[PDB]
Write a protein that binds this ligand. Structure first.
Ligand SMILES: [Ca+2]
Ligand SMILES: [Ca+2]
Ligand SMILES: [Ca+2]
Length: 189
C-alpha cells in the first residue's frame, strides 16, 4: 500500500486548515476486528515539513467510550512510523507508535514519546477529529523521501469493550510490534 503526503505546516488545533485539501485523503479499510459499515473508521490526510509529520484523522464513531483501563481498548487513534522504512518484523530505534483518544489523552507504544507528539481533538457530529504532529526522531526528510506508515482506529462500545480494529495498511492487528505491516508514505513537495 502506497500513499503520499504534501509538504506543509498546519496549526494543531482540531480545525481543518485549508492546506489539508492539497494532499490526498486515505481511508482505513484494513479490518482486523469489526466491519466498515458498523465500526469506527477514519478519513486521513497527511502533511510534512523538515521537523514534523502531520496527521489529520476524521473519525466516524457514534458512541465514544474510554472506560477500559487499556488505552488501546478506548476509542482512539494510533499512528505508526518507520523513518528509515526498513520494514522490519520488530521495532528498530527509529520506529514508533503513538496513541491519542477522543479526550486528547496521549499514550505511547515502543518508540513513542510525548516530547515528539502534539495533538488536538475536536468532537463533531457522529465522531471526532484528531490533528497531530509527530516530530522526526532520526531523519531530516527531503522531497521524495519514503517512510513506513500506518494509522489505526480502535472502536470501543458503551461497555468499555473494544469491538473494532481497523487501519490503513494492517488487517492483522500487529502494527504495535511489526513495521512490515505498515504501508509506504511518500513525502512529496
Ligand atoms: Ca488545524
Ligand atoms: Ca525503522
Ligand atoms: Ca466507539
Amino acid at each position: 500500500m502506497v500513499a503520499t503526503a504534501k509538504y506543509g505546516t498546519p496549526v494543531i488545533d482540531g480545525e481543518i486548515d485549508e492546506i489539508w485539501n492539497t494532499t490526498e485523503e486515505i481511508e482505513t479499510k484494513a479490518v482486523a476486528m469489526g466491519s466498515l459499515d458498523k465500526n469506527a473508521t477514519a478519513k486521513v490526510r497527511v502533511l510534512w515539513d523538515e521537523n514534523y509529520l502531520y496527521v489529520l484523522a476524521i473519525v466516524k464513531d457514534p458512541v465514544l467510550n474510554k472506560d477500559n483501563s487499556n488505552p488501546w481498548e478506548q476509542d482512539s487513534v494510533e499512528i505508526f512510523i518507520d523513518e528509515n522504512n526498513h520494514k522490519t518484523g520488530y521495532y528498530e530505534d527509529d520506529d514508533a507508535q503513538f496513541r491519542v483518544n477522543y479526550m486528547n489523552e496521549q499514550t505511547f507504544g515502543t518508540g513513542g514519546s510525548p516530547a515528539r507528539f502534539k495533538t488536538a481533538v475536536k468532537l463533531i457530529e457522529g465522531g471526532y477529529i484528531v490533528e497531530a504532529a509527530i516530530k522526526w526522531k532520526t531523519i531530516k526528510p527531503t522531497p521524495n523521501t519514503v517512510i513506513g506508515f500506518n494509522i489505526q482506529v480502535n472502536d470501543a462500545n458503551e461497555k468499555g469493550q473494544r469491538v473494532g480494529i481497523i487501519s490503513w495498511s494492517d488487517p492483522t492487528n500487529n502494527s504495535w510490534r511489526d513495521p512490515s505491516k505498515f504501508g509506504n508514505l511518500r513525502l512529496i513537495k
